[PDB]
Amino acid sequence: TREQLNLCLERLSSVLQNKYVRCSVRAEVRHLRRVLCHRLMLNPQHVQLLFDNEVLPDHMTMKQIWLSRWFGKPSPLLLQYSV
Amino acid sequence: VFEFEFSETPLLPCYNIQVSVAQGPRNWLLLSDVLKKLKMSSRIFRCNFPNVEIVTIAEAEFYRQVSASLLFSCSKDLEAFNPESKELLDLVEFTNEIQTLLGSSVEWLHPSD
């Protein structure tokens, strides 16, 4: 298989449940947004993903976010979501 | 199709390690990490999962493959290991069954909702 990486999701200013997420390195922001919608039982496009209070583009992969903002930081990668 | 693991408990590190040339790199957990979380004996684990692959690997070799990875660029994610060690480590193959046993739920995202 392909590399897996570990995320921890945090609500910022209806909550999650299981905030630790493992996914494929190729998983993209858009995919995570939809999977989160499913778990929170929301319509599509009601969850945006953020790092350091800025919205992440739909086409960015989890691996990019790691290398660009989390390089040399301890696992898991910390992301936030808004509803 | 994309596979996601959700857990309200921190995740064990997943290691991408080639054990056989024929197989290429595969995903594994350190068995001691699994056994610690469950406080379970090696014996009970192997009895209950007789067909989950466990392999032994030199800690030295383990260190080289793991440090090669950009995702293990933090010193903290490697400090439990010794680059020159001749000790053998046990790796358990990282299956959905193991993820489930360790308390997580596995979800599948398809092109549609």
From Swiss-Prot, chain A:
The keyword Metal-binding applies. It is found in: Nucleus. It comes from the Eukaryota. Residues 3-83 are annotated as: RING-finger and WD40-associated ubiquitin-like domain (RAWUL). One of its GO terms (molecular function) is zinc ion binding. GO terms for biological process: chromatin remodeling; negative regulation of transcription by RNA polymerase II; regulation of DNA-templated transcription. GO terms for cellular component: nucleoplasm; nucleus; PcG protein complex; PRC1 complex. Changing residue 20 to A: Abolishes interaction with BCOR and BCORL1. Ubiquitous. Changing residue 24 to F: Abolishes repressor activity. May be a PKC phosphorylation site. Keywords: Acetylation, Isopeptide bond, Metal-binding, Nucleus, Phosphoprotein, Repressor, Transcription, Transcription regulation, Ubl conjugation, Zinc, Zinc-finger. Residues 3-83 are annotated as: Required for the interaction with the KDM2B-SKP1 heterodimeric complex. The keyword Manganese does not apply. Interacts with BCORL1, forming heterodimers. The PCGF1-BCORL1 heterodimeric complex interacts with the KDM2B-SKP1 heterodimeric complex to form a homotetrameric polycomb repression complex 1 (PRC1.1). Component of the repressive BCOR complex containing a Polycomb group subcomplex at least composed of RYBP, RING1 and RNF2/RING2. Specifically interacts with BCOR, RING1 and RNF2/RING2. Component of a PRC1-like complex. Interacts with CBX6, CBX7 and CBX8. Interacts with DPPA4, NANOG, POU5F1 and RYBP. Component of the Polycomb group (PcG) multiprotein BCOR complex, a complex required to maintain the transcriptionally repressive state of some genes, such as BCL6 and the cyclin-dependent kinase inhibitor, CDKN1A. Transcriptional repressor that may be targeted to the DNA by BCL6; this transcription repressor activity may be related to PKC signaling pathway. Represses CDKN1A expression by binding to its promoter, and this repression is dependent on the retinoic acid response element (RARE element). Promotes cell cycle progression and enhances cell proliferation as well. This is Polycomb group RING finger protein 1. The gene is PCGF1.
Swiss-Prot record, chain B:
Ubiquitously expressed. It is found in: Nucleus. It is linked to Microphthalmia, syndromic, 2: A very rare multiple congenital anomaly syndrome characterized by eye anomalies (congenital cataract, microphthalmia, or secondary glaucoma), facial abnormalities (long narrow face, high nasal bridge, pointed nose with cartilages separated at the tip, cleft palate, or submucous cleft palate), cardiac anomalies (atrial septal defect, ventricular septal defect, or floppy mitral valve) and dental abnormalities (canine radiculomegaly, delayed dentition, oligodontia, persistent primary teeth, or variable root length). Residues 1-113 are annotated as: Necessary and sufficient for interaction with PCGF1. Coiled coil: none annotated. It comes from the Eukaryota. Transcriptional corepressor. May specifically inhibit gene expression when recruited to promoter regions by sequence-specific DNA-binding proteins such as BCL6 and MLLT3. This repression may be mediated at least in part by histone deacetylase activities which can associate with this corepressor. Involved in the repression of TFAP2A; impairs binding of BCL6 and KDM2B to TFAP2A promoter regions. Interacts with BCL6; the interaction is direct. Forms ternary complexes with BCL6 and SMRT/NCOR2 on selected target genes promoters; potently repress expression. Can interact with HDAC1, HDAC3 and HDAC5. Interacts with PCGF1; the interaction is direct. Interacts with KDM2B. Component of an approximately 800 kDa repressive BCOR complex at least composed of BCOR, RYBP, PCGF1, RING1, RNF2/RING2, KDM2B and SKP1. Interacts with CPNE4 (via VWFA domain). Isoform 1 may interact with MLLT3/AF9. Belongs to the BCOR family. This is BCL-6 corepressor.
